[PDB]
């Protein structure tokens, strides 16, 4: 059976939006396939604000979360592989979940 | 977060 993460990071990301919190998602830079702006990387991670305000055209997918975002004025799309999904959280007060390890994201 | 607050 494929992996759950995706479906809970949704579920997750649409109950922070809907209760007024900005989405936040915390990435692996390490992971195989992160396809993000250098400079984002700090101590091996990425935190990035997933609100529609702060992207464009934000997709969800199972095996990938993509979309447009603006690092200080530069458009830039970012590709990140499911597997380097980590967590997802309230920037307002840290709420969230912290995704369980999945056999196959190893 | 890295990116900007607003995108568009």
Redesign the interface.
Known sequence: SSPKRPYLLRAYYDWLVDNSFTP?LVVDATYLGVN??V??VKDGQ????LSA????NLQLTNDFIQF??????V?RELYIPMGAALAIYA?ENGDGVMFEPEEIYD | ?8
């Not at chain 1, 305000?53 to 464009?56: D, E, F, Q, V």
């Not at chain 1, 447009?68 to 004025?73: E, L, S, V």
């Open positions: 936040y993000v702006p400079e984002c990425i935190v990035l604000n305000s702060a992207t464009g447009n975002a603006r690092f200080k004025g458009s920037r | 977060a890295c990116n900007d607050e607003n995108y568009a």
